[PDB]
Amino acid sequence: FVNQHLCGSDLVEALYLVCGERGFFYTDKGIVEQCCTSICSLYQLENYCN
């Protein structure tokens, strides 16, 4: 969807548009530190949801 930073608000909003089913995975938070101030990788973000 985007090739820049998104941070929770967008990180979560995207993980939502990324999967759109069971609210993707968002509890442990093994990320958000490089996808908010740094760029991420839609490929990896598309693997958080089941």
Contacts of residue 27, defined as CB under 8 A and 6 or more positions apart, other chains included, come to none
Contacts of residue 21, defined as CB under 8 A and 6 or more positions apart, other chains included, come to 49, 50
Which CATH code is given to the segment(s) 1-50? 1.10.100.10
Contact status, residue 44 vs residue 19, Cβ threshold 8 Å: no
Contact status, residue 12 vs residue 35, Cβ threshold 8 Å: no
Q: Where are the alpha helices (DSSP H) in the chain?
A: 7-18, 42-45
Domain ranges of the chain: 1-50
